[PDB]
Symmetry: C4
Subunit: 179 residues, 4 copies
């Protein structure tokens, strides 16, 4: 019965909390035990949804938040209709306007560090990467940040707020030092 | 009690399913017996609605999905107020921005083939044709595709997803080979 | 218990029907007895609302549809803050973008005829007039039609549909010849 | 049991009334006793919300209307991510598009007078000020009025309407002469 678990449930929206619970159980993880991961999973969902909401009405397909199987089905349809290359790991969105997949990251360290780790991992000459930290930095492939400034600013604002809420509950250091 | 019938009811939205049922009974067809047609009818409704949703707020009148009589009443009002020519077969939308009717098609073969068949049929020097296939092709009158790229991409994505769902249930070949 | 009364209640939206009933009782008229006026009042409400919906989000103040007293209060605030001249008769909208009041008319005759009658009546060097007929014509002050083409086309479409519905019930001639 | 209290509850939206009640109790004030302040607090909330609604979708963060603590948390996140200077008094919005805080004022006197008082108070070389009166004037830092004309016009309209409602109840002079 952790403080972090109760904190997450009052910080994030109930739909986000339930998608995060569903995602963690799919990969065999327990949200009551791995409560830092529970927070991170919610955070990442939220960001990905605020991101898709920047931009014009039909711009993004949302991959993140779906069941694994359906997410891959949607990736294949997209691959099979734009001719874009099939990613090896599930990305988070597809950008119909620039014809590319996007991998959104959210990190409690240097973006430099998390970007390289993502780059190396997916090795998809194609897929765009976009990282945000909890201290306001972002880093994106070819310095091309996809959305305009006001929509990314909102996300960075929301991340700093989450950090403050954690810190004022004394949960921030345990969260920071378990990434 | 076919697998296809239950598949359609979980693939499409309930409002689409009910309009499709209404349309088939109007033409004396039974959705429980002619289950490929039931799928096609849902598909065509869906596409036509995703199509009207591309574009700016007042752009399209939606003809498809209405009762026959009301659909013709709306066609006549449009004819009677823009001076456009009265079509012989009901189209699916009217484009207020380009002042033309549009016939949307969705095909399980070559678009070349289905386009000619539509052309020949309506013989309306006026009415624009726009076909989509389930393998991502589209074809439109004067190569003028009406909407921008992202809205048509979404439709082609959704069609490929429907195809995958059918195939993973072993319904795809029976659907493909009954068009 | 007229056919026209039941026709109006199934043709127009319930909120429009209730505002029309409220407006007629304010001027001492009975919607069950004066059923042509009941139709016209609904029609005029509808049009004025479809009109305000053309244009960008804050463009119009809606005067029509309010209680008399509140409508005048809103006119005075507008006069008292833009310095525009106080109209003698209640108009239907205010255009914040062009800084003028608008009088919307809907006629079962020549627009030429109804426009002059409106002009003469309000004598407001200032207030813009915009008439629509049920046969698709419109006429506006300085040939300046305020909205773009697609939003006015929709209105003219809806008016022709109302006319057809009346005619197929044999109510059209009585409505036409009582304006 | 004042007339002003009942007037406010029928003039303003219930959500605004409840936020105003919450704000006044936070600063130890009683909405039943200080009924002019209750009106002013509602007015100021309303304006600030109509203001945030002018502009494009992600443009403003809304600070006003939150609990004190959360409002400061949001200010800090914004400061901590845009590098803008921390204000000493809580502002009402943040403008992501121009990267500044905004202090909205609403006054029953000369805007000249209320602007100086605000200027002097916050002494934030940075924060933009935007005053509206109940007689239609506005005044803003560097004559830069943030929103376009139609959105500010709406606000000034609404303020004059509130003034008229008060005056026709004989509450206006007591409200005017207690600011
Ligand atoms: O907080 C808000 C503000 C506006 C509405 N809303 C509710 C939640 C949506 C996300 C959900 C996303 C979720 C919802 C679950 N499902 C399953 C059936 C279809 C659907 O939408 N989806 C969309 C497809 C993939 C996926 O995982 N969104 C974003 C698009 C509209 C919506 O509900 N959202 C959008 C901005 C932030 C946010 O949380
Ligand atoms: O899935 C969604 C996302 C946004 C809302 N929604 C519900 C269904 C609407 C279509 C219906 C169409 C249908 C609805 C039935 N009726 C009868 C009375 C009026 C009305 O709308 N219409 C519109 C006129 C002709 C016709 O057959 N649409 C499209 C426009 C808004 C709406 O409900 N829709 C729009 C995009 C895909 C889709 O399915
Ligand atoms: O059919 C639709 C499609 C979109 C929503 N909707 C419901 C009715 C609204 C009009 C009402 C107007 C009415 C509603 C009654 N009231 C009294 C309290 C505030 C309010 O709105 N108003 C607006 C101020 C003056 C007036 O008479 N509209 C238009 C603006 C949003 C709305 O509800 N509407 C807008 C397009 C056609 C139409 O009928
Ligand atoms: O009258 C209308 C027309 C459109 C919707 N709506 C309801 C009230 C909203 C304000 C509320 C603001 C309030 C609502 C309370 N909360 C607490 C949880 C999140 C939230 O929204 N917020 C937003 C964040 C800070 C704050 O105090 N707004 C403005 C944005 C959408 C909304 O509900 N609003 C927007 C234009 C005038 C107005 O009164
Ligand atoms: Mn990611
Ligand atoms: Mn068709
Ligand atoms: Mn009128
Ligand atoms: Mn203020």
């Amino acid at each position: 019965g952790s403080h972090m678990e109760d904190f997450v449930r009052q910080c994030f929206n109930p739909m986000i909390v339930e998608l995060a619970e569903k995602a963690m159980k799919e990969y065999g993880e327990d949200p009551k035990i791995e409560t830092n991961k529970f927070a991170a999973t919610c955070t990442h969902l939220e960001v990905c949804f605020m991101y898709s909401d920047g931009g014009s009405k039909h711009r993004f397909e949302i991959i993140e938040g779906r069941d694994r199987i359906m997410a891959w089905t949607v990736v294949n349809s997209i691959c099979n209709t734009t001719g874009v290359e099939k990613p090896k790991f599930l990305p988070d969105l597809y950008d119909y306007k620039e014809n590319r997949f996007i991998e959104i990251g959210v990190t409690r360290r240097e973006v430099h560090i998390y970007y390289l780790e993502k780059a190396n991992k997916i090795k998809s000459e194609k897929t765009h990467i976009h990282i945000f930290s909890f201290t306001g930095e972002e880093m994106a492939t070819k310095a091309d940040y996809t959305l305009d400034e006001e929509s990314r600013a909102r996300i960075k604002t929301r991340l700093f707020t989450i950090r403050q809420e954690m810190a004022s509950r004394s949960l921030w250091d345990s969260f920071r030092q378990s990434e």
